[PDB]
């Protein structure tokens, strides 16, 4: 159900078995027994379940919201468009929270996959995590419990004013 575009995974590179010893492998014996006893009835039950699903197949859709006017083009005191912009901002905040969760899972998956080479081969994942956490700290940090579109806009305006003042010299 998941896609490698959003959950990237390098292709596995397993080595071929080269048994120098003449002893039988209990892992291979127990694995073959494990498939023949467990995997076949489980996949039979799941195939019966899946054909019942195909007999009664239903569909659901992912909801999409159009872009309401943002709070910058929105008059103060006129609580209608205040409310619309604020709930759009809250929706985008939740979306950014889940984006952060996605990036954190990517970083954890990289570290577990590389193992002892995580300090070198996870440079791209760590760089992506660092860039996205710098952006998140620029947009949402230190807002408080009553975080809102107005508070985010005030913080962004303060940051832009500081950057403009620092850009004069």
């Amino acid at each position: 159900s998941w896609d490698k575009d959003v959950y990237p995974e390098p292709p596995s590179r397993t080595p071929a078995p080269s048994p120098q010893t003449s002893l039988p492998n209990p892992i291979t014996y127990l694995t073959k027994a494990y498939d023949l006893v467990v995997d076949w009835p489980v996949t039979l039950v799941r195939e019966f379940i899946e054909r019942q699903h195909a007999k009664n197949r239903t569909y659901y859709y992912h909801r999409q919201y159009r872009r309401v006017p943002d709070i910058t083009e929105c008059k103060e005191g006129d609580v209608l468009c205040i409310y619309e912009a604020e709930m759009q901002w809250r929706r985008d905040f939740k979306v950014d929270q889940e984006i952060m969760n996605i990036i954190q899972e990517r970083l954890k998956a990289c570290q577990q996959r590389e193992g002892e080479n995580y300090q070198q081969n996870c440079a791209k994942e760590l760089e992506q995590f660092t860039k996205v956490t710098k952006a998140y700290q620029d947009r949402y940090l230190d807002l408080g419990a009553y975080y809102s579109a107005r508070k985010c806009l005030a913080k962004q305006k303060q940051r832009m004013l500081e950057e403009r003042k620092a850009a004069r010299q």
């Binding site: 005191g77 006129d78 609580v79 209608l80 409310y83 709930m87």
Partner: protein, 63 residues
């Protein structure tokens, strides 16, 4: 029912509350202005009636 019903109900509630807020602020301003300078219907303090004034000619001509 769905999210749009709650969304538009919230919009209507917010519109009603904002209209009540601006109406209360305006009636504060109206009452303050009218009490400061009574020229409308409210805060009209009484005044003796002209209908109980004698206008007939009297004994003393210099009235």
């Amino acid at each position: 029912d769905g999210p749009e019903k709650n969304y538009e109900k919230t919009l209507a509630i917010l519109q009603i509350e904002s209209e009540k807020a601006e109406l209360r602020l305006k009636e504060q301003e109206v009452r303050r202005l009218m009490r400061a300078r009574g020229d409308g219907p409210w805060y009209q303090f009484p005044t003796p009636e002209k209908e109980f004034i004698d206008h007939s000619p009297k004994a003393t001509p210099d009235n």
